């Protein structure tokens, strides 16, 4: 993985191995939850929205917000994995 | 602002102006909340942790996680502002 959110290096500098592992493990769990949520909302979108032919509206907004949170958190998770050097169990 | 989270461009492509404005406005509110939370936890850290001389432990972990969420969401907000071309009221 690559460092996508650089400020995380300074934040976790010198953190004990077990502590960084704990943070990363929880971030993996969070990622799974965010992916599941975004996926659930994507599946319920009309075909026209899934293909990008239609845009806008409350339902679409909710999916986008869920996807935004997923992508943002994923950048953090990838960064944590990059710092750790491996994907903890 | 600059595009820090590229997937957001595809997600918001063609979104009606009012809809993108709504999403960005809520992201601004979210950012304020996350900054306040991270700040509150930073202030309560012992001086040794604020200066980086000490690292690790439950309290530090909680601050780091709050800061991580803040930074991640901020990358999303900056990206939304970059796409919109301005900071909505």
Give the CATH number, domain containing residue B11.
1.10.287.160
Query: What's the gap between Cα A43 and its chain centre?
Result: 18
Crossing angle for the helix pair A58-84 and B58-84, nearest 10 degrees?
130
The whole-angstrom distance between A12's CA and the closest CA on chain B is 7
- Structurally, how many domains does chain B consist of? 1
Q: Which of B13, B23, B68 sits opposite A8 (nearest CB)?
A: B68
Q: What is the domain range of residue B11?
A: 1-89
The whole-angstrom distance between A41's CA and the closest CA on chain B is 13
Helix, coil or strand: residue A57: coil
| The total number of residues written for chain A in this structure | 89
Structure solved using which method?
X-ray
C-alpha A15/C-alpha A6 separation (Å) is 16
A65 in contact with chain B, both atoms CB, cutoff 8 A = yes
Q: Which of B7, B26, B67 sits opposite A71 (nearest CB)?
A: B7
Q: Which residues contact B89 (CB under 8 A, 6 or more apart)?
A: B25
DSSP state of A6: T
- Residue B48 vs residues A11, A36, B4, B64: alpha-carbon distances, Å: 14, 39, 32, 15
B22 in contact with chain A, both atoms CB, cutoff 8 A = yes
B11–A52: do the CB atoms touch at under 8 Å?
no
């Amino acid at each position: 993985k690559k460092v996508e959110l650089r400020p995380l290096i300074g934040l976790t500098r010198g953190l004990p191995p077990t502590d960084l592992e704990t943070i990363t493990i929880d971030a993996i769990r969070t990622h799974r939850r965010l992916v599941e949520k975004a996926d659930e909302l994507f599946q319920a979108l009309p075909e026209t929205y899934k293909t990008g032919q239609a845009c806008g509206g409350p339902q679409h907004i909710r999916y986008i917000e869920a996807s935004i949170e997923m992508h943002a958190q994923m950048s953090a998770l990838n960064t944590l994995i990059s710092i750790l050097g491996f994907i903890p169990k």
